[PDB]
Each structure stands twice: as C-alpha cells, then as structure tokens.
Amino acid sequence: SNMWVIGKSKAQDAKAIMVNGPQFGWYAPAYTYGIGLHGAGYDVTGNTPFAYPGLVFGHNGVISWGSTAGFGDDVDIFAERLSAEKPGYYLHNGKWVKMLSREETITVKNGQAETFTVWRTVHGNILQTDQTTQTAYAKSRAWDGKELASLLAWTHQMKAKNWQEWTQQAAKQALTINWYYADVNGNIGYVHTGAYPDRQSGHDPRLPVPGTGKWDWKGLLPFEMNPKVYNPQSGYIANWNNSPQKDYPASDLFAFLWGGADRVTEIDRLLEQKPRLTADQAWDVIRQTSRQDLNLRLFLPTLQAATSGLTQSDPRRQLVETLTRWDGINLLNDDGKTWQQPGSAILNVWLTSMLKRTVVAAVPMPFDKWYSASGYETTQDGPTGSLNISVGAKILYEAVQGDKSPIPQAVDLFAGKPQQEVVLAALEDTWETLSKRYGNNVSNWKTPAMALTFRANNFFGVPQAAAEETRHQAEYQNRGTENDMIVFSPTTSDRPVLAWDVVAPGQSGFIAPDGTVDKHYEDQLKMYENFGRKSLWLTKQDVEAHKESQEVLHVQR
C-alpha cells in the first residue's frame, strides 16, 4: 500500500493533498465499499474494506485520513512447557496452570462433521504445528483483547476536527497500522499506530521466548513511543510499507526487511523532483509508480561498473546499455500482451541468477529457498498483490554496496570471487537464456507483460461470487486496489475540499435471480483501468444535486 500526503509548503493550488492506494489484492465484487454517513456526530464520505463501520479512506470536510499496514513487530511466540502427566496444563510462574479450551464442530455440506479442540494459554492460542510431548507454542499479540477498541477507534476518528482530537483516537487503535492525517488548513500528520510490547531486557524479538514466566512482557509501551510526525520539515509524508522512523524495528517475518533498498524511494523521488505539486500531478504519481520497475534503480550502478570496461560488441555490456537507456516505466505494446521494453525480463533473469550464486549459496538448505525469489514471480492471472523488492534482493543490495552498507557482511555472499566476475557470469546467463528465447536482435524483443485479475474468490480463497464474475484487465498496475485523493482548500473550486476515488468493478455486487446485473455492477471498471476517478460528495447540496435515487425508512429501536 502506498500513500503520499503533501502539505502546504509543497501543495500547488491547494493547501494539502492526500493520495492513498491500499494494496489488498483485486476482487469481484470490490474489496472496498463506498459510503457516506450524515448525523449523530458524523459527516463523512469515502470507502472502506468489507464495509467496516469505520471508514478507512475518507474525509469529513475538515480533515481526511488514510492507512497502510505498519508491519511493526507486535507478535511474539511463547514456548509453553508441557507435561505428559498433566495433559491440558502448562508450567507458568512455578505452577501447573490450566489451559483454556473449547470444543468446535465443523459442519460439512455433503460430508461428515468434524469435532476438535482449540487450546489457549495466558500467552494466546496454541499453534497446531511444531508440537511435542514437551512443547507447545502460543501466539502472543500486543493487541489481544483490543480488537473492538481498534474497530471503534477507526470509527470515532472520523469525527476528529484537529490533530489533537485525531491522535487521541489513533492511540486507541491497537493493530499495527500506519495512520495519516490532512486538514483544510494544510496541516499533515502521520502515526505508526498500534500496541507494542514492553519486552524484558535481553529479549530478541525475532526469536521465541520461554513461556514459563521470566520472559513475560512487562506490559505495553506507551503512546509516546509510537513513531509520529506532525507537519514535517520535508513538507511531505510518503510510505509504501517502508520503515516509519530511524532505528524502528520491523516485523519479525524472515521475508520482510526495511533496508537500503526500498520501493518507497520511488515516491520520494517524484515528490522531491518538483518543488510543489498540483492535485493532478499528485494523482499522476499513481500511474508512474504503478509501472515503475523496482529493481532497475537498485542494481543499475552495479551493472554499469561491472561492464564499464568491456568492448562495445560484448552482449553483456549491451544488455546493460539497454537498461541504462530505460526509464524503467513499463508500457504495453499495441497487442495488449507484451511490454514495449525488455528491461524487466532482463533484470528478472539476471537477479534470479545473482541470488542463486550469492545469498542462496550461503544459506543452508532448505532455508536457502527463502532467498531465491527475484520478485517477478507470478501466474498467468498476474500478481495477487503489490510488486516489491524481494528479500534476497534487499540482502544482495547491501552486499553490492560494499562499505557503504551499515550491515556487517559476516559472510561474503560473493565467496571470495570479485563482484564484477559474478555480475558478469549472471549477465552471461541472462544473455544465453534470453537470446535463445527471443533471438539475437534485442530491439525486437516482445516480452510478456503482467496482467491483472479481479478474483471471484476472496483473499481467503473462498468464493464471494460465481467464477464467471472474475474480471480481467490487460495491464497489471502496481497500485492500490482502490485509489482515493482528498484535496484541501483547492484554489479553483467553490468548496473548501474536493475528493475522488474509484471502486472497481463497481459499488454494487447485486445480480437479480434472473441474472440481471445491477446498474452499478461494473460501471467503474474502465475508469480504474485508465487511471480515471469519480467525485466523492459530502455536502447536502452536492449529494442532492447528484442524487439518482432516494428512500426513507421509519423505524424505532
């Protein structure tokens, strides 16, 4: 998920601009739901996932808000000590304590029901895997018992009218989420919200801890610790699931890293490139980042150095010149199937080869597999989510940075070999592979483009529509499942705020019994495709002027 908030010092023809592109995957019907609420202290417009009571993407005419997953480390694992003699108990603070347990029955269509038991300790529910007569692992969330509070915090924040009222709600949201603020006066803000544990001294949060007691969390860190900024000197706030703040530790996931290589640099670059940006230019950042190859910028210098001293006819050198002339912005050919330039295919093959010769070669099997993905992997349906720099690539990047990397290279990923030789050997593989496939005339290479699918099964893999409802889009775009922009104090409008979004395929998922699809079933699909957007209304007069239907209910609780 990406987000850029542009404040007063950098907004052109406006005081603040917020552009959010949450990356939830693509589904039919739409992942989010458009809704406006007017009364009982609320006055808001926007759209939100699964129609949560609280709008994750929206505004109230005074402030606007958005989110991207924070990926902080708010979960630790406790290795409980068991005993064969006391089934259902675990040792904790010197005593054998009784686990919580419940019976569940999975009823099954056209099948036999299944009954099983779920177990929980003071640290959280027990994991099925990694079980032994002596050990069971509990999953401990800093947000345990704060589910409802987070749901309400996300709702109540909608009524905030300034930074102080908003951060008050942000402090109650316990999940690890980045929250963003903007307002009519041009103020902008950011909070890496969530509950985070106050860990014992000596507790390495990347590894499990004994559950017998001495390693229990002290409590939760206070809100003062949560990374936050209000009106930053930079004049902008940009995020793409990258680190919130210097020295802030990431999620413990082995496939997740905040390092020198980060896709967020792609956004910082476009915001810094122009002193001030208009709403239209800020929106345009979606189109550009959604087509930007994310590895070009990181490895190009390494690629140039390695081939800088080769003759002109060297095919390795020429693959690099090709990359050098490229902006890295993929476009479709007239065929709607292939990319105008072969750069991503080149980088993909080369990177895959580099990882296998380096990081992969240094890690013991089968962990080595964790570091072999190039980040271009996909199926014929295209990516299920965003495109990112792979974990191996991030590690590889520290290595090619040499002494400029702050990470001590305990082991040499290049294993004594000069970096240039290994980079060349990988360029050799790339040329052999690609030339064998497309021929020796690079300029006519028509490599496969990624496509995009709005899936009929939800993220769980559960149908939420019939299979035939799947929608297809020729061009994959590394962008939000939805995109909304809020523009405060636009100088060319009669309103103090303007707002747009796109909810594809459409607002409605309804199909009548006879198969007649709703009028709003697919009216936003082509709009999504061409980086279009429609207006979000807020005031009574705007909603009224754009009304298509109206219905009044009379009900008493």
Binding site: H38, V118, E147, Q245, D252, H546
Partner: protein, 206 residues
C-alpha cells in the same frame, strides 16, 4: 423524526445515510450493505468464523479449522458486552439494518435473492454484533496485524550456527534478518526524530 432514516444514492450508486441517532445511522449503513453486497458479506462472515464448509463442502474443512484455532470467540463477545450503549449502538444498528433487508429478501426471494444464493444452494440468515465485529477482526486484524515467523527464524539461526559456528552464525543471522538497518528510508526523516529503544539481537533469551 427521530425514527427517520433517509438513504440517497449518487450517480455511482454510492449511498449517503441521513439519521438523527447512532443506532438509526448505522442501521441505514447495514441496510445499504445488505442491498449491495449481501452475498459477498455472507461469505465473508463465513470465512472469518470458519463455517464455509457448511455450504461449500469438504474442501474447506481444513480452512475452517485453521480459522477457528486462530481466535477466541468468547473473548470477542466479552469485548462487545463491555461496550457502552453508544458504541454498542454502532454494532447493533448495523446488524439490525442488515436484518431489515435480509427479512425482505427471504420474504420475496423470487425477485430479491441475489442469484449467487440460488447458485450455491442456501439462503442468507440474520446478523448480530458479533458477526459485524468478526468481519473486522477476521479481515483486518488477522490478515494484516497477525504476522510472525519466530519459529522458522530460530530454525534458520540454528542452522546458521551449525554451519558457521556459534559466533559467526549469530552474525550471519543479523546479516540476513537484521533487527534494524540505519540506511532504511523512513517515512519520518531523521531530522524530526528517532526511535529511542534498543533491542537485544543475540537471542539472549537462551
């Protein structure tokens, strides 16, 4: 009228609810959700509670079991029971609004039942605050805030120490899975602030 709920839909079918109190406002919200996304929401409810197999069969049993092992329904219910009347009104209203539409749907299914229900062979049932709460718990908190691989991490560290020895093994883990990396581009610039906490990165819990 305190009992009046007005629903106005714009050029894209997007609903705007107008109401006086908390309960009526979210009643309207639930009502339009049931009009727009009933099947999608029904299957979402089932995914977040692990009751998909009830309607889709044996291929979803493992899935159902995994869902149920990952939360504790009673704790969620207790959080709801501790809610103030105003907060409860949000969840109750929303559930009631859905129920109003669902009742109309099951009263005249020949014209209002979304086709998918006929296709998959079942009809929609009423909602309660628990259900609404679990939509959020199951699709936000569990999908995006429940990540850890500590067990795998210790496994990797253990292999590294076997291969490279203890001291070097620890050093390589800190090279492939660093705790922090000062060159990481951050949303908040260093000029503004830094995180003041330092963490053990030697697995000293052992």
């Amino acid at each position: 009228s305190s009992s009046e709920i007005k629903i106005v839909r714009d050029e894209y079918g997007m609903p705007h609810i107008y109401a006086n109190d908390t309960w009526h406002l979210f009643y309207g919200y639930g009502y339009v959700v049931a009009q727009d996304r009933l099947f999608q929401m029904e299957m979402a409810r089932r995914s977040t509670q692990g009751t998909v197999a009830e309607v889709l069969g044996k291929d979803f049993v493992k899935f159902d079991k995994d869902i149920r092992r990952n939360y504790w329904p009673d704790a969620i219910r207790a959080q709801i029971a501790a809610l103030s009347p105003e907060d409860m009104s949000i969840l109750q209203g929303y559930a009631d609004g859905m129920n109003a539409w669902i009742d109309k749907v099951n009263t005249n299914p020949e014209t209002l039942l979304p086709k998918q229900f006929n296709t998959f062979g079942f009809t929609p049932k009423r909602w309660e605050p628990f259900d609404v709460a679990m939509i959020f718990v199951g699709t936000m908190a569990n999908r995006y805030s429940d990540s850890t691989s500590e067990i795998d991490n210790l496994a990797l560290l253990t292999a590294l120490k076997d291969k490279y020895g203890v001291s070097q093994g620890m050093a390589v883990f800190n090279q492939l899975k660093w705790l922090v990396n000062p060159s990481a581009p951050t949303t908040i610039a260093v000029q503004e602030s830094n995180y003041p906490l330092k963490f053990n990165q030697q697995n000293s819990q052992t």
